[PDB]
Structure formats: structure tokens, C-alpha cells
């Protein structure tokens, strides 16, 4: 890699953004060197389901010195279900364990699972507090540039790096967060589609209206240092679809520059 290849990649990201009516927010970090490829890195974007990574980390932190928390079952009822709950809807009544809820919200993006975990922590402000505790002053869990439920690509990249690769969590908790995110089921068309097939990817997607299409995580090449990938996209038209292809293309541009 080189600075000039990174400069080239950043122009390619700008040219990629021109292909849709919106904004591309991107950070890729080669942890071998701290080399960063960035686009609109300091702008706020709606995070959508990508916050579930920060959620799950906060839950893992509560479990330090209390591993049995992960086996604790949380009951809930039908009235507790919110839209898009493909796992939790099958377990109304007795409910699911804390670990099951983390896996459901990370791997299937289950919304009720996220709400139950947010409640366990004491509310959305507890998730924001956790973010502050690992050095993230930007993340906020609470539309024409409403800052609620937003972060920046730079801030989320730093948090993803610290959580999955660095020391924000204890070693065992880092391992568990990675294991869950390596098993993601919702990201096949996003970062995973753009990086080499030989790289293991731990990722969390986010999708919303205004063509909001996000994917964050870490790629683990087989004989190199990990590369952090954060991709946020959002558009001017509320009706617009998220663009899996753009997310994949952004990751590809960075992967090409770093090899």
C-alpha cells in the first residue's frame, strides 16, 4: 500500500458516490499501518441497525465477571414485539436468553431483541454512555439532518476497531462479539460481496428509508493484519432503495488499494 494508492482510492469513492442521489460515508483502516481511506468521514449518517454492534458490546461488558448473564432468559409477550423480529416472534412467552438475543440482533437484525437488550442495560442512554466509555463521543442512540440516532463513519470505525480488534472489551468478550458477527446472515451482498472471498468478515448491516444502506465491521485476511470497513450511505429521496452494490463497490475500492 501507499499514500498515492489511497489518494486514488478516495477519488474512486467520490466517483462511486456520483452514481446515486445521496451521500457515501466511508472509512477503511489497514491496522498494520493505520493507513486510512476515507470519504465524508466526519459527516453524520443515520446508523440504522448498525448500532446493534455497540448494543451487544455493552451487554458483553455487563457480563464480565458474570458469564451466567448470557444464559439468563428474558420473557416477553406479543405486545412487546416491534416490526421485523424474525427470531423473537417465535419465542413469545418464555422468551430467549441474553446470548440468544445478542445473536438474534446481530445476525438477523432482530428489532425486539435489540429493544429487550436496551431495556436490560437501562435504556438507550445506557448504550450512549457505553459508547462514551470506549472513547466514542459521537455515537448517539435516542431526518433532514436530524442528529438523533446518528454517528460518523470515523467515529464508528474507531469504535468497531476498538471493539473487534482492540482492547475496548476484555479478550473473551471480544472473541464472543467476533464470533457473533462472523456469523452474520444479513450481509452477503455488502462488504462480503466486495472484499476477497478468502477474507473472513465480521459485519453488521443497517437498512432504512431514504435509501439508507450501511455495513460496518472487520475483514480478517489470512496472513495480514485486520482491515476495518465502515460504509454508510443515505439518499435524498425517501423512496430510494439501499444500494448493496454501492456498499460492495466501496469495500472493493479500499481492498484493492490495501493489497
Residue numbers in the entry: 22 to 163, 193 to 258, 260 to 272, 274 to 311
Sentences from the paper on this structure:
In contrast to the PenL-WT structure, in which every residue could be mapped, PenL-tTR10 and PenL-tTR11 both had a highly disordered region, where the mapping of the residues was not feasible due to high mobility. In PenL-tTR11, which has a longer tTR, nine residues in the upstream region of tTR11 were not mapped, in addition to the first repeat unit. In both PenL-tTR10 and PenL-tTR11, it appeared that the α10 helix structure (13 residues: 183–195) downstream of (in the case of PenL-tTR10) or overlapping (in the case of PenL-tTR11) the tTR required the second repeat unit of the tTR, instead of the first unit, to be in place in the protein backbone. In the PenL-tTR structures, perturbations in the omega loop resulted in the dislocation of a number of nearby residues, along with the disorganization of the α-helix in the omega loop (Glu166-Asn170), which most notably led to the breakage of a salt bridge that is normally present between Thr167 and Arg104 and tightly packs the active-site cavity. Asn170 was found to be further dislocated in PenL-tTR11, resulting in a wider opening in the active site cavity. Furthermore, the side chain of Asp240 was rotated approximately 90°, moving away from the active site by 3.21 Å in PenL-tTR10 and by 2.89 Å in PenL-tTR11. The precise volume of the active site in PenL-tTR11 could not be determined in the same manner because a key residue, Asn170, had swung away from the cavity. However, for the same reason, it is logical to assume that the active site in PenL-tTR11 is larger than that in PenL-tTR10. In contrast, the interaction between W1 and Glu166 was lost in PenL-tTR11. In this case, Lys73 may act as an alternative general base.
